[PDB]
Design a protein around this ligand. Structure first.
Ligand SMILES: Nc1ncnc2c1ncn2[C@H]1C[C@H](O)[C@@H](COP(=O)(O)O)O1
Ligand SMILES: Nc1ncnc2c1ncn2[C@H]1C[C@H](O)[C@@H](COP(=O)(O)O)O1
Ligand SMILES: Nc1ncnc2c1ncn2[C@H]1C[C@H](O)[C@@H](COP(=O)(O)O)O1
Lengths: 520, 520, 520
């Protein structure tokens, strides 16, 4: 009925010995996009050209972690458990209120239209292109008491060449072609979903460095050739070759059982403006050209933080493109001069297992040495996976995405979003929503032309998302106290992680999940 | 209730090994026609005069194919099955929203009137004159997200003579005389119907030409007279008559078992303006007079695309009145100079079985030859059906009508709408709808005169139509790959068969159903 | 509920071998009469004075035939059956919509007031004075798609003398003193009733003339005196009286078994202005005085079409007050000069059984003849019923009333409304309706005076009436084809019995029910 609420606002976290369940609700506003029509989209810009469509529909996105975890909760989670992975989810939209706007002259009036319908469907079948997954605004806001605007749905189409235009292959997906539920106030929508078994994300830092796992005290039983000649001078000395049983201490020489990492090199820049070479953002030598990129169908796509690699700590004066950058509290606009106002994610913790972003993978003999010809070593920058390699994935972040859909392709290797998160073949479905059109008074004599005059409307209501996370406690045997993340903030005039006098809420730092320790 | 939606918007196609089921929904607007009154109609113009009535009611029409098939679906259908025929249908109207308009000065305001009634009835009994069937706008729009205006219902009355006026025979049908359902928001209407067994429409092209079905290798065992005299000169030669056993190769002479087609000749025009003789559109020699027409009760009615016949291909520079013409994307107004902006349907495929539109049926001896008198052949233009004739019907088109009602008459022959489609004795019933009147404030003292002051209202809601089609797969034994319809469009700036940047949607080409092949 | 319709609009006729059932619906508007108060009424004009009251209530009246029969139906009925008589009825009012009017300056605004009540009761008990019965507007309109205004209820009180004033006897009936149902939107009202057995109305014309029913071939066996004297001259001749056996041919002399009619003479006027004597409408010799009237309690009441009698055919140049006059299509105002614009009912058919309106009943010997004194015949103008009389009742008319209530009196004779129709002791009850009052904002301090400030309101909804008629087929043995009523209208520019270009609907002719024939 019109008079009855169709759902209660509950946001909660319930913790278990084995599983924690998060639940949060938010209020949303839904405009009328593109005055009700699908629009072709395309621009051709050389290293950017793209093509696609913009839709009258909007969608709900809960892909950021902070959507379901209050800071404290995130804390609880990461200081206590080694791994976590999502198990099941369920969503419900309710208290739909459709508003109609009179828009008188000078003043715009708004009043409820009780008999109006907003339509929601979610598609399981994954027939619509998935977009919820990468790098984008629209997720519910972290702070509960913040109303948000449902994002408009638009999708990309395959672009052939450096020039944007469409081939027969390009396709059009029309949301109205799908069956969807129609609601009015007093109507509600609900759906459930079960995640697929997925590797627990590792929420620990290695307490051992891969290269040396051996017993410091003993020495291998293998021998290596130590020197072709005597002395410490490169090209002089007595001819004889000498072999020696690998002894305790010459660890760098120990034959090991594993190779540390897959790797792609990244350019490095210094946070101090002064240190960098001059590089423009446009023109023949715009930065893009010098930053590690992957050429695809004639178009440079700059590699996103790439195959997981070690990166300078957050405080460090140098930073690489490999690390993710978050706004930070103080920044006002879209652009800023000093990087002291930004937040940098860093994977120092990964260093124990795999190569550094700005440094190389290693160096290989790139030549066959000989008495008359000197040995030459080649610098290796790109290294595909090799038998016996072991690496760590990029960590997840409080404000980082949670899942991402694994491309529907013949081949994929070690799916783990590179931006961080769990790779799913069938990820939480995008739930679409749109305000049904309505018509302005219409002409008395019939005209075939499609109607174009519509009443102005917008809707609002609350959505509630609940996720059941499966986690695993630590159970370590380490004796010395671990590192844990605790605020440690100095005396503050207006406390952190809280709304302020203005009433504004902003997240102070970016937070990872690897504080606990574990050995290899 | 007011608060609950009364139906969900589902548009879908579900495909089966034997039957495909289409389902689509749309939103509609219903004005108030003729300020609530039935109006007599008639004009007397000489080759057009007509008489009838216009009604306050409106009706739903789903007679165009594209109403139920998305382009892709239509594709799927035609590249795979030989025949198709509709089996059953069901419709439902819901989410009725009645609006009332304040119409203040300068600004017109619109607000919901919750307690208002719109009335729908559909008549099975076919007591009202059927009109849904021919050549007319009003069908639901092809693209789902397009709102449409319900068509106003008006019907024609029998006109006697070249002058319009009415005889006692003329009749008046008043929609209020039928019982109909009354709805308010929260009320819905639904109905079902079952098509009658009907010949599967042929969705194939003949891979054999009727005239020669015989075995190329052998020769008949019959003899024909080949020549009355010797030489190759028409009136000279040796007297003797010669007979010869019909041999392989003289196929044109083979006695056959069947005659190719029923036929009516059509004038032909050239797409190149220059080629045609000059012909006005008005006056004593307006085109109408020269285009093949059938005289009925003193009135020329120009024959619609006539008895199925072969027609020039679409690209051809010449076109006949026999072919159907569709607007085409680019055309702006009601009229255009160059036919390059139009779309032409063509029945080249039919050529294998029956005569060409612009050419004749054949030529008959129109005389008894004799040694002193030469033989004369008559050109045959009109040919009624003869025993042993076999012909193909006009193809259906993606945007062509689907069914048409078979006239209630003593005699009909080979009912197949000539415009294309399935001929039904009892076709899907016309569903009528109208907004119930309401009254402006009315005078305090009683007056017999019928009330004439009404509140201004219009309504809107969605209708959903579902049709269950019975189809039959091909099962051919042809070895070489068939022709199939695939887009083949060149690189396009704004892809075809899709909305564009303006947001406009228009169909690129007219599409038939005969791409698959089959032998006679 | 507010959102649900409370009844469907069905108008229908279903025909049976023995009984036809009519059903029709209409939409109505109900004002607020007399600003909510009963008002005394009286004027004293000499031959008109009257006294009574006007009520805030309104009533539904379905007393005209055309309310339930579409022309065609009426046709079907009368060309096929000899008699008809109503059997049962049932009514229902629904979709009540109460409107409230804002009445701003210059512009009057109207909006729904959902919580408002309109009250309906029908009284069986016949405690309220019946008025539905005679000669009055307010019946539902014939054409279905015509909205009508509910009539205001007012009743007459007994007037003593030529002067209007009231005696103790005069009574006041207050509708609020009766229990009535209260409705709001979503509420509906319904009631049923059963007619009482009543003589089938005769829908036939006599094919025999009363005066001669005897066998033309034979001659009575009685003798009458033919002549007192010889010759053909009135006062001369031979004395002897002569008697003669009544022979075949001297039919006027045959002693018969029955007397033809009850009768009252009527003045006759000629449709041609020229023929009449000059007579004013006012003053000492206003027409009224010369037109046959019945003096009651000192007041002339002009006799309504009187005791059934024969009347000139409709086309005839002379017409009498005995015939009923209907407006006719073309007439614009309340008054007209030429009677060619009117419609006249006529009872030529009755002539076979009873006397003519303008002519006399017969002539009686008004004296005792004697040899010295001549015989004198008296002209008889008024003739009460005599043993052995047989007469026909006035016919019913398509637009004539159906029933009328038989006065509650000690004595009534051969009840048959004189205006035509069925006489019932307990006729279909008057159904009363009124919009409940509502109050304008009222003063903060209490005042005993009855409230007088009310919000302005009016209501509307549909009423549906169903009547079950019992009819009896003809079953005649007449050989020659009967007369039947068929349109026979000439070619018309705008067909008859139908709405026109203006959209106006008007009935062309008045139609009776006696087309079929039957013998005495
Ligand atoms: N996040 C995520 N989603 C899906 N699949 C993943 C993910 N991370 C690793 N993998 C895959 C990569 C290999 O297919 C497999 C190896 O199992 P392992 O047990 O890791 O040796 O696990
Ligand atoms: N579209 C359509 N509707 C109704 N009747 C049709 C149609 N097409 C052909 N026919 C009729 C014409 C003949 O009555 C009959 C011959 O059956 P046949 O099997 O074709 O030899 O089929
Ligand atoms: N219309 C109507 N209503 C009520 N009573 C009527 C009517 N017409 C005639 N009568 C009465 C008059 C006598 O009381 C009775 C004679 O029955 P009969 O069978 O006619 O000889 O029928």
């Amino acid at each position: 009925g019109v008079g009855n609420a169709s759902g209660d606002w509950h946001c909660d976290s319930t913790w278990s010995e084995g599983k924690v369940t998060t639940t949060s609700t938010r209020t949303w506003v839904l405009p009328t996009y593109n005055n009700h029509l699908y629009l072709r989209l395309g621009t051709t810009s050389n290293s950017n050209t793209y093509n696609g469509f913009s839709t009258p529909w909007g969608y709900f996105d809960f892909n950021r972690f902070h959507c379901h975890f209050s800071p404290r909760d995130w804390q609880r989670l990461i200081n206590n458990n080694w791994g976590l992975r999502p198990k099941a989810m369920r969503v419900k939209i309710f208290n739909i209120q459709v508003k109609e706007v009179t828009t008188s002259n000078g003043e715009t009036t708004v009043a409820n239209n009780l008999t109006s319908t907003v339509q929601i469907f979610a598609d399981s079948s994954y027939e619509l292109p998935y977009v919820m997954d990468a790098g984008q605004e629209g997720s519910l806001p972290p702070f509960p008491n913040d109303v948000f605007m449902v994002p408009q749905y638009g999708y990309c189409g395959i672009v052939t060449g450096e020039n944007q235009n469409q081939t027969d292959r390009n396709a059009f997906y029309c949301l109205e072609y799908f069956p969807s539920q129609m609601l009015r106030t007093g109507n509600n929508f609900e759906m459930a979903y079960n995640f697929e078994k997925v590797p627990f994300h590792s929420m620990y830092a290695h307490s051992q460095s891969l290269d040396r796992l051996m017993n410091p005290l003993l020495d291998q039983y293998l021998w290596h050739l130590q020197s072709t000649t005597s002395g410490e001078t490169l090209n002089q000395g007595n001819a004889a070759t000498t072999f020696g049983k690998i002894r305790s201490g010459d660890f760098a020489f120990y034959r090991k059982n594993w190779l540390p990492g897959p790797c792609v090199k990244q350019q490095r820049f210094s946070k101090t403006a002064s240190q960098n070479y001059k590089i423009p953002a446009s023109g023949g030598n715009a930065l893009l050209k010098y930053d590690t990129h992957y050429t695809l169908n004639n178009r440079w796509s700059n590699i996103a933080p790439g195959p997981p690699m070690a990166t300078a700590g957050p405080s460090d004066g140098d930073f690489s493109n490999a690390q993710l950058i978050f706004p930070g509290p103080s920044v006002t606009g879209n652009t800023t001069t000093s990087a002291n106002n930004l937040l940098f994610t860093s994977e120092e913790e990964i260093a124990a297992t795999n190569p550094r972003d700005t440094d190389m993978f290693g160096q290989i003999a790139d030549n066959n040495q000989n008495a008359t010809t000197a040995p030459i070593t080649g610098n290796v920058t790109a290294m595909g996976v090799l038998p016996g390699m072991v690496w760590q994935n990029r960590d997840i972040y409080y404000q980082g995405p949670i899942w991402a859909k694994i491309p529907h392709a013949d081949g994929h290797f070690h799916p783990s979003p590179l931006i961080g998160g769990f790779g799913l073949k069938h990820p939480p479905p995008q739930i679409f929503i749109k305000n049904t059109p309505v018509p302005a008074n219409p002409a008395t004599t019939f005209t075939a032309a499609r109607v174009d005059s519509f009443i102005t409307q917008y809707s609002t209501g609350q959505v509630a998302v609940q996720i059941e996370w499966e986690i695993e406690k630590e159970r370590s045997k380490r004796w010395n106290p671990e590192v844990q993340f605790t605020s440690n903030y100095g005396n503050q005039s207006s406390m952190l992680w809280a709304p302020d006098t203005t009433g504004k809420y902003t997240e102070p730092r970016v937070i990872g999940s690897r504080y606990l320790t574990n050995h290899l």
